[PDB]
Amino acid sequence: RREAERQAQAQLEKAKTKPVAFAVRTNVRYSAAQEDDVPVPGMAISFEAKDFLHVKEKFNNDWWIGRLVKEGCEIGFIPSPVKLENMRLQHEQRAKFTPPYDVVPSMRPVVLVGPSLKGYEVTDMMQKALFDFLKHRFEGRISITRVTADISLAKAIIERSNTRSSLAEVQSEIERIFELARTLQLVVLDADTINHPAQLSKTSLAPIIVYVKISSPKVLQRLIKSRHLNVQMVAADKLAQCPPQESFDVILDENQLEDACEHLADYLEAYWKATHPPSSN
């Protein structure tokens, strides 16, 4: 009867206050349709490619409960992978607690890559002053932490790193990120080896990369001289090459501490509003 939809709506209203089970990353676009046989139609949460999705609980085999990561979002019926696959086979047939969901931490790590190589005092004082701002401002929320392991290494002879950074230790650090993100606190990593955003592309962590831009190589020349410069030039020129629209979420091209900190702080407040809907509490 129609009562099952009412019990479903009750399960949803109960779901809205529930803590997140696990976030996932979509690999395909998906629009809602009446043929989808949504248990509670008009509540379906459609998603574009590479959309992030918090998941609260398993409503049923055909549908999971969860929410999209964006402002104004509310709890709803995120489609199950089996349902998406069944609709895929159906459309192909009509044509005549690989897979659609990559696991991601509930809170994305933030890596402030650039201007160039890490481990040198210029860029080190740069990013460190940045973490100082992020710490004193986002007090009681932000959870900055160092990662000695190279997280970029994370993905019938068993795979093994030839580097001192053992892959098992990397797995341990990844689990530490999975635990740290469970608290829904802000996270901003201080990874050492991550000189370029592309290295983290294979990671399931889905990092919030930050781009502290210096468009002019000569400026950074005079900067590093003002206090290993050449490899720093190839690296900075390399980061200059990268596509801003996708590779980076934020460009800290601002020179003074004040305005740049205002931008990145406003950004993190935007993400903070995105990750914490009123209905959750």
Partner: peptide, 29 residues
């Protein structure tokens, strides 16, 4: 006169150093 202006102009039609001073100010912090 303005016609002479348009005549010359019809065919006639610092960030580096600012980045230098501002980023030196950045390391200065």
């Amino acid at each position: 006169v303005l016609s002479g202006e348009f005549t010359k102009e019809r065919e006639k039609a610092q960030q580096l150093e600012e980045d230098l001073r501002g980023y030196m100010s950045w390391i200065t912090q």
